[PDB]
Amino acid sequence: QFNPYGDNGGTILGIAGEDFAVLAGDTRNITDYSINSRYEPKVFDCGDNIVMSANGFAADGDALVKRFKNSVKWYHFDHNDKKLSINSAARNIQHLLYGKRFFPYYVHTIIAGLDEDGKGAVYSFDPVGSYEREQCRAGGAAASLIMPFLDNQVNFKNQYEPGTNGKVKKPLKYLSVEEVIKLVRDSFTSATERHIQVGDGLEILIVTKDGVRKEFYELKRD
């Protein structure tokens, strides 16, 4: 029997800073125990200072990103070149996803950018389009390896002030983009060690008021 779905591996990670956001993904594409490509980009600049990744089944992921980019184009045509704000992009993607509620896009979608006050924003979607604004979200193969680490090192979960023995929480300081990128690289370095589908390369898209920048790092190729 024909199975219309597949699994192309991949792990993605979005983190919202105070006045920036990053969306990162490994560049390895797999089926079963084979590598299809060591560099197949999976995080995309969609215009209007929005970056997107739809991780999971790559055919559905590519179709969704392509449809969203198109929706940005038509939003400009239909609404006097108005900039598509991140909250509006998020609601729009919910409708793209829920339109296939009974034959879903088999992907976990994350978008990142800045909200209308210039603050960092990340939105996370399930395959049929429930979504929420979040500070921190890993998706895909190694998500379960990465999130607990982020809970501990971004949100300081289970850390208390020395001397108070559990009476005073470690206070939640704001991280710079350099700091966030360190946590992203260590997240993926660790995931690469323990997850067979994670490796080859790491591509990070960084969004600020100045636009979208890229960074690339090698990961282990075994």
Binding site: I30, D32, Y33, S34, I35, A141, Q153, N158, Q159, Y160, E161, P162, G163, T164, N165, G166, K170, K182, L183, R185, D186, T189, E193, R194, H195, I196, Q197, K220, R221, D222
Partner: protein
């Protein structure tokens, strides 16, 4: 897993990668897959790791007793025959896929054995999820009358093809060379092409970070005198 065996001039070489996995998770990054059946009979195992270890130990034990009984050095064909008859009886339920190599008074040998109990003979063999990658290298570079150095080279190249191309394989190359009239040389982590780069940050915590409800000393000592 990627495992290979390669015959050469005066002996036989086996090699393996060092990754063991549970589904997509790497349980152990420096697994030892080259097992000793006897001093000069070694085997490499793919499939259910408990089974490859257990079946190797059991036949190794019985081979040692056989050796003492007969006052003779163990033969590879004996290990082979005992392995295959044990595996056959269990009808594939013992998930051991092995490459068995060794030297004995009769010469040098290389066999493969499949979980249901079939065996094969050859000058070069590969097993495991990485075996198609390994076999591509062996079919490209193997020739008759390899030297020791050439066979070690070929065997580890073949494992490397598995390491880089098979998600089921990774980390390091282990090699064992069995040459006629010599001690078997086991070369653990013969190649080490996958050391983790230094992390960006140290994650050592300040002392007192963790909240504690209770402390106590645990008595690990036996009941005391007096």
């Amino acid at each position: 897993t990627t495992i290979v065996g390669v015959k050469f001039n005066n002996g036989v070489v086996i090699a393996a990668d060092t990754r063991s996995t549970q589904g997509p998770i790497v349980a152990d990054k420096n697994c030892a897959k080259l097992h000793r059946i006897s001093p000069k009979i070694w085997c490499a195992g793919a499939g259910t790791a408990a089974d490859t270890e257990a079946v190797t130990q059991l036949i190794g034990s019985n081979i040692e007793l056989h050796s003492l009984y007969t006052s003779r050095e163990p033969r590879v064909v004996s290990a082979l025959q005992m392995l295959k008859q044990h595996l056959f009886k269990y009808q594939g339920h013992i998930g051991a896929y092995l490459i068995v190599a060794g030297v004995d008074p009769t010469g040098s040998h290389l066999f493969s054995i499949h979980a249901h109990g079939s065996t094969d003979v050859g000058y070069y063999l590969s097993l495991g999820s990485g075996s198609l990658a390994a076999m591509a290298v062996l079919e490209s570079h193997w020739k008759q009358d390899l030297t020791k150095e050439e066979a070690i080279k070929l065997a580890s190249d073949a494992i490397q093809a598995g390491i880089w191309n098979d998600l089921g394989s990774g980390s390091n190359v282990d090699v064992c060379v069995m040459e006629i009239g010599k001690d078997a040389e086991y070369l653990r982590n013969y190649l080490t092409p996958n050391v983790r780069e230094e992390k960006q940050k140290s994650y050592k915590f300040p002392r007192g970070t963790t909240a504690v409800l209770k402390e106590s000393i645990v008595n690990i000592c036996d009941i005391q005198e007096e």
